[PDB]
Write a protein that binds this ligand. Structure first.
Ligand SMILES: CCC(CC)O[C@@H]1C=C(P(=O)(O)OCCCCCCN=[N+]=N)C[C@H](N)[C@H]1NC(C)=O
Ligand SMILES: CCC(CC)O[C@@H]1C=C(P(=O)(O)OCCCCCCN=[N+]=N)C[C@H](N)[C@H]1NC(C)=O
Ligand SMILES: CCC(CC)O[C@@H]1C=C(P(=O)(O)OCCCCCCN=[N+]=N)C[C@H](N)[C@H]1NC(C)=O
Ligand SMILES: CCC(CC)O[C@@H]1C=C(P(=O)(O)OCCCCCCN=[N+]=N)C[C@H](N)[C@H]1NC(C)=O
Ligand SMILES: *[C@@H]1O[C@H](CO)[C@@H](O)[C@H](O)[C@H]1NC(C)=O
Ligand SMILES: *[C@@H]1O[C@H](CO)[C@@H](O)[C@H](O)[C@H]1NC(C)=O
Ligand SMILES: *[C@@H]1O[C@H](CO)[C@@H](O)[C@H](O)[C@H]1NC(C)=O
Ligand SMILES: *[C@@H]1O[C@H](CO)[C@@H](O)[C@H](O)[C@H]1NC(C)=O
Ligand SMILES: *[C@@H]1O[C@H](CO)[C@@H](O)[C@H](O)[C@H]1NC(C)=O
Ligand SMILES: *[C@@H]1O[C@H](CO)[C@@H](O)[C@H](O)[C@H]1NC(C)=O
Ligand SMILES: *[C@@H]1O[C@H](CO)[C@@H](O)[C@H](O)[C@H]1NC(C)=O
Ligand SMILES: *[C@@H]1O[C@H](CO)[C@@H](O)[C@H](O)[C@H]1NC(C)=O
Ligand SMILES: *[C@@H]1O[C@H](CO)[C@@H](O)[C@H](O)[C@H]1NC(C)=O
Ligand SMILES: *[C@@H]1O[C@H](CO)[C@@H](O)[C@H](O)[C@H]1NC(C)=O
Ligand SMILES: *[C@@H]1O[C@H](CO)[C@@H](O)[C@H](O)[C@H]1NC(C)=O
Ligand SMILES: *[C@@H]1O[C@H](CO)[C@@H](O)[C@H](O)[C@H]1NC(C)=O
Ligand SMILES: [Ca+2]
Ligand SMILES: [Ca+2]
Ligand SMILES: [Ca+2]
Ligand SMILES: [Ca+2]
Lengths: 387, 387, 387, 387
């Protein structure tokens, strides 16, 4: 076992090849499948796993009732092999959690699970499944984290947490973690910015996080930092607006775009110099569709001009959260960090007539070979028997 | 593989971080989950497992009928990874048993499973799943043991067994076990004491057991011993009374507290010099709630004064048995033996209107970092379909 | 990996300690559990497994209909860890089979699965799951084998097969198998003997098989042989008659006891010089109860006098087949081959009002420490929903 | 780990011994079993696995509705151990796919999964579960592949893909793949030939593929090639016609036999000089029965004369696709490549009155020891509850 280096740059990619699909909701009609949301993928140097927040309940059972609710003492962070349905028969228990992150440093898994009251939640950090640290809410207002993988470089792993309002100014901290122990943290000085649910990836020994402004931004905020937590902040400048909801595409801003800026969805993007690969919903107003868009000047430039779109989920189909995950050279044998992404396909409440909310997932990896657009949606027929 | 040393002292702890939650009863509404009681956790130098006594039946099936009953030829000791629901698809078979213990010496698992008639029960000891010894009832009155992990030091493991009445004087024996073979035993000379269901942990090469006085004590008895089975006995002196039922807190005794002393619940406590960490129910009269209390003078002093309470399960929620488990330095990389605990959350009979009784579990580990009180209860909605 | 020696003698045993119980039928009321019969246990130098003949169907499903029937193209030999219920989620596939045997030589598993028409059945031999030999019926009348483990000594494994009538003289062959290849066979010259379903175990470099005379013997036939297949034959002489059905105990014979001799049940016994440990049903007329009896002169002497009985299953409870299995020194660390046994607890047809027949299992290992009699029966409540 | 050589010739075989049977459809009546079709087997140097295209749904659940349909975004390539039922609790996720292939080079698994639109489908190649290449449709008309294992020789693996009409001339390409990367491809110049769903096996360092002519041939086309993709083409000359549908046996042709040539079924055959082992349906008009036929002159000669038939599935029972798989010397310890085959037993639509279509499987391996004909059919009773 050797620590992941994380010093190479992101692989160049022309399109996105399909990597996995679990069909969780379709299978959970009959099989014993957890009610989940906030899924994400992360890889060790030997496998990729799907992590997820269960609701302590199965699909099509009465305890799925009320699962629109975000935070309870029943929620647990669990994981299973990528592409398999999350069941009690194939899932590893990770942590008690209603917000989470996880990543592998090359030697062992770090998991981060936040539970406890809204006014005093505690993140429990584990390394190889042993508790190695805790951090308690410093603003007493829903201490919360990425809902996607943390990022590792040279034996350290990194994450972002938020505490305070989700509809106004809050407080955002970056953490350096070594063998599950917090060895440094910094509070970002980011007045008028809003960071939620960051998608963070390593690139050339530094971390780049693309997050969600749930306050007053329909473009996405970003924070980038090196191993010592020296950080910079901005918003993606492209007029191909990344959040949901958002306005129609038009001239962008390098600061938060107020139009349709309140609310949001977890997302990601990958920076390539001045260019950006953006994943987003197809609808400007709800969690429908998914597409990947290459804007060669979109990280730093404000026009609404792009060079490539690839369809992922059709406009009339349900999408949800999305996030980055990477495959490092130690896993792939490549000379670059391979970028991949996942999409959560949310079914049930609030859009559909059910007692429950749950999701399935799809994922893709970036390649420089031929790809195609299509739609790979959830495919379950709702409502279910229990509804 | 190397034997666990067990020579370091208990880690200092300021609070209890949440470690696991299985949601067994909620999941067993639909999934194939064993009817269980008497769960406990124990760790090897590589993983922690949940051990439990099944009823040879699944939740929501007719064979769960009558599972208030303690002893039958259908009960088996099985185990699964911590935090996973106990199913026939993820559980390792250990022993035929209606009372049990288990622990790992650093090389292999010892399990102890008692079965047979009330007038002549036999404990079957296994090391790495091979039968290595038996011990038969010496009082012909329900030979029985810890219902939690045994404790290992320097290649030997240790347990306590009781035979005789549960409402009067009985007989209590301590055993030293090496590779599943009993190499020494002693009968404790403890007139007017009652020991049931001991929670035993290693600390500085000696074993400390905190047990249940089911006869006439609402504080908890203790027995401590070294590897040669030279032992001392007492009761926890604190007026923060540890058993359930019990009286309201008041001046304690270093002997059995007669008030509300009959009956009891399995529990634990950790000794730190003159101080004690006590886990107990919140109700004085039934198995409701759970809390951890630090009394800095409570091992040896009789006042009802404490310095720290942390809530675990709310007063209006069902609790049940609780027990110690430790994580040794060989597992954690620490310089001390880490104390942890589990709580059984009992659902069904006798408190609820069901044909069945079963439990889920929560667990916590001691840390010297920030923690919080909350309630993490079972969460199943009873009755079930089968009722 | 090293070949099992099989050169030590059988461990001396005073009684039988309980080793496993699966509760298959009770669990299969709800869980996904195979309809099985003809279970047996066998151990490698690392684990013990339960082998069984499935009916290609689950309990409580319509395809369990008609499972009184012995031979079909749907039956498969599968295995799972000892004490676990045989499900499609925990069972390894071994062979297509309606009669079987299996054993581990110290390096790999041999399995033997017989399938095909009654007039031309073929045994398929596999070593480490690769087909290594076949043997075809030589009498065109239900080629069939042990339904329990084969026996290994010094890199060779041994079994017995029968072809011809089950109610008259048939033909019986002994086979020596090396890495799944038949290297020698002999036809036993045994006029007026009947051998079915042999329970064969190694002892002092030789194999002893105790079988079932389904023709005209209520005591059990035996055949013993060395590695070169030089063999001797006899019947257990004790008047503690071993088969079911049988007469009440009285003076025995060293030849087949005609009284109630037609029909039978698979069984076993262990030879200790002139003495014998006999396992048998408690009823003389049906598959009810189980008990172990030590007769110190019963291998070679004809009196109905015994020195020890231990109860296993009560007289009013269903039993079924039973068989030997051993644990060699390479597994246990002992200086002798440890004798163990299993009992099949048959439920459904023909004794009960169901569409189906299936079994659960119990097992025990011989020890020289304290033991007790009891009853550990199946415990399912019939009929089931599907009936 | 060492690359498979693939330089020895095919083992000589006199008959086919039964290797596995899963009973998937029978078990899926109650258990949680995927709706599948297009199953196939492939082996590593350590195990054999069943690969299959799921429909993202379970048997006896409403999402099995409409599963006669071939191509959807819900279909996934998954695998499980040979002989086990394909469930979400025992199946490894491989790829998103509605057409597939897989094989092991001695070091790692290659999988090939085709998904996307009919007018632009993309094959995603993975080596050890990491995406290593893609190939996009070059004729924009259902890019598609073997539905059975690819073939490996000396660190390279080989497959055939088709793009264009299934009822007229299409385009056929052969690919050489090294560690999941396409290192060479060639378009076969095969005017008036039709290649679908090739069964390809290694033999003496070359690959032989026997396929399906869905255009105008009731005998089977073949293509053989060496590692550099120098290829030859023909049709099996025997008058024992291999496809379904077909005419009654009569004088054959070395070119496509037009009589009943439209449509087809995936199949295989093994070449032994001028002779051929043919597997085929028993019915000339539908997917009923299965039999193996040795024609000692049938590869190159046109008579309808044969030397050996062995029955596999009875004339009145449902069959389906069939395919080759091999076991190399590195797995078996033999000096030749062992030929084996599988049969898909298709149940449901279009032949039966159900909402769904799914299959079970049987397999056999070639031996030079005694064998027998029989019928090992699916055995499920249709319709099911959901119908
Ligand atoms: C902004 C970050 C964060 C601030 C607490 O909130 C996150 C947002 C979401 P999100 O998917 O946007 O929520 C959908 C709400 C649907 C409301 C429907 C109303 N109908 N009814 N009843 C889910 C997350 N688990 C949640 N995180 C935590 C930790 O709770
Ligand atoms: C005191 C130790 C021991 C002495 C035999 O009894 C233990 C106590 C308990 P406990 O949880 O306190 O029992 C709850 C009784 C509820 C009675 C309800 C009445 N309604 N009805 N019908 C469970 C344990 N398995 C049991 N051990 C064994 C070996 O049987
Ligand atoms: C004697 C050896 C052998 C000779 C073929 O027969 C064995 C005997 C039995 P056994 O348990 O004794 O059978 C119970 C019969 C119950 C009949 C009930 C009648 N009611 N109805 N319908 C099971 C075995 N699988 C069977 N072996 C094979 C290979 O078929
Ligand atoms: C010829 C190769 C290929 C050309 C696209 O078609 C293959 C043929 C079959 P096949 O088993 O022959 O199809 C059975 C059709 C039954 C029709 C019943 C009509 N009733 N209704 N509604 C299955 C395969 N998945 C399919 N491959 C792909 C990639 O779709
Ligand atoms: C990353 O570090 C490795 C190991 O020293 C080195 O070979 C490589 O050049 C670095 N890569 C980049 C892209 O900087
Ligand atoms: C869901 O919860 C509501 C409100 O507590 C209740 O009225 C309803 O019956 C529940 N439904 C189910 C299926 O449990
Ligand atoms: C990586 O960490 C090592 C060891 O802590 C440190 O000495 C070094 O500066 C770091 N290397 C890089 C390339 O950032
Ligand atoms: C326990 O033993 C180890 C190994 O000899 C030693 O380093 C350590 O000091 C001991 N610890 C204590 C706390 O006594
Ligand atoms: C439970 O057992 C009782 C008493 O034997 C019986 O009357 C009742 O019907 C049973 N219930 C179920 C669901 O089996
Ligand atoms: C531990 O056991 C060893 C070996 O049996 C013994 O010699 C020694 O006294 C013990 N050590 C301690 C530290 O108790
Ligand atoms: C069996 O063989 C071993 C190894 O040579 C030897 O030590 C032993 O004496 C033999 N045992 C008996 C009981 O013959
Ligand atoms: C069992 O089979 C019989 C006879 O074929 C049939 O009449 C009966 O309905 C079947 N029962 C079930 C539950 O399938
Ligand atoms: C065991 O097998 C070996 C090797 O085939 C042989 O030489 C020897 O005679 C046998 N030994 C015993 C103790 O039977
Ligand atoms: C295949 O290669 C091996 C290894 O060099 C060699 O021993 C063998 O003769 C070859 N086999 C054939 C049948 O050509
Ligand atoms: C199957 O689909 C058809 C057509 O969409 C529908 O009318 C029918 O009810 C469905 N059946 C089930 C069991 O879902
Ligand atoms: C096998 O591959 C090697 C290495 O690429 C090559 O040098 C050789 O020609 C090939 N050998 C055979 C026997 O085809
Ligand atoms: Ca926003
Ligand atoms: Ca008490
Ligand atoms: Ca008889
Ligand atoms: Ca054709």
């Amino acid at each position: 076992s050797v620590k992941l280096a994380g010093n190479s740059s992101l692989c160049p990619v022309s399109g996105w090849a399909i990597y996995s699909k679990d069909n969780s909701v379709r299978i959970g009609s009959k099989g014993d499948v957890f009610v989940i949301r906030e899924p994400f993928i992360s890889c060790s140097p030997l496998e990729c796993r799907t992590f997820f927040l269960t609701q302590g309940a199965l699909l099509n059972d009465k305890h799925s009732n009320g699962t629109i609710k975000d935070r309870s003492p029943y929620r647990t962070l669990m994981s299973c092999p990528i592409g398999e349905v999350p069941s009690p028969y194939n899932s590893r228990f990770e942590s008690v959690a209603w917000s989470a992150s996880a990543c592998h440093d090359g030697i062992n898994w770090l998991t981060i699970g936040i539970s406890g009251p809204d006014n005093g939640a505690v993140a429990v950090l584990k390394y190889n499944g042993i508790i190695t640290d805790t951090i308690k809410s410093w603003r007493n207002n829903i201490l919360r984290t990425q809902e996607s993988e943390c990022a590792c470089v040279n034996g350290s792993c990194f994450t972002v947490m938020t505490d305070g309002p989700s509809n106004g100014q809050a407080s955002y901290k970056i953490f350096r973690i070594e063998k599950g122990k917090i060895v440094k943290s910094v509070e970002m000085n980011a007045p008028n910015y809003h960071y939620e649910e960051c998608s963070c990836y390593p690139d050339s020994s530094e971390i780049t996080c693309v997050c969600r402004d749930n306050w007053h931004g329909s473009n996405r905020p970003w924070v980038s930092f090196n191993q010592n937590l020296e950080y910079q902040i901005g918003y993606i400048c492209s007029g191909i607006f990344g959040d949901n909801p958002r306005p129609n595409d038009k001239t962008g801003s390098c600061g938060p775009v107020s139009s349709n800026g309140a609310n949001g969805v977890k997302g990601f993007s990958f920076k390539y110099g001045n260019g950006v690969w953006i994943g987003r919903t197809k609808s400007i107003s709800s969690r429908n569709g998914f597409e990947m868009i290459w804007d060669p000047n979109g990280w730093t430039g404000t026009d609404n001009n792009f060079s490539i779109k690839q369809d992922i989920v059709g406009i009339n189909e349900w999408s949800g959260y999305s996030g980055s995950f990477v495959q490092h050279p130690e896993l792939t044998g490549l000379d670059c960090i391979r970028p991949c992404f996942w999409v959560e396909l949310i079914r049930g409440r609030p859009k559909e007539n059910t007692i429950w909310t749950s999701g399935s997932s799809i994922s893709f990896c970036g390649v420089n070979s031929d790809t195609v657009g299509w739609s790979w949606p959830d495919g379950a027929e709702l409502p279910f028997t229990i509804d």
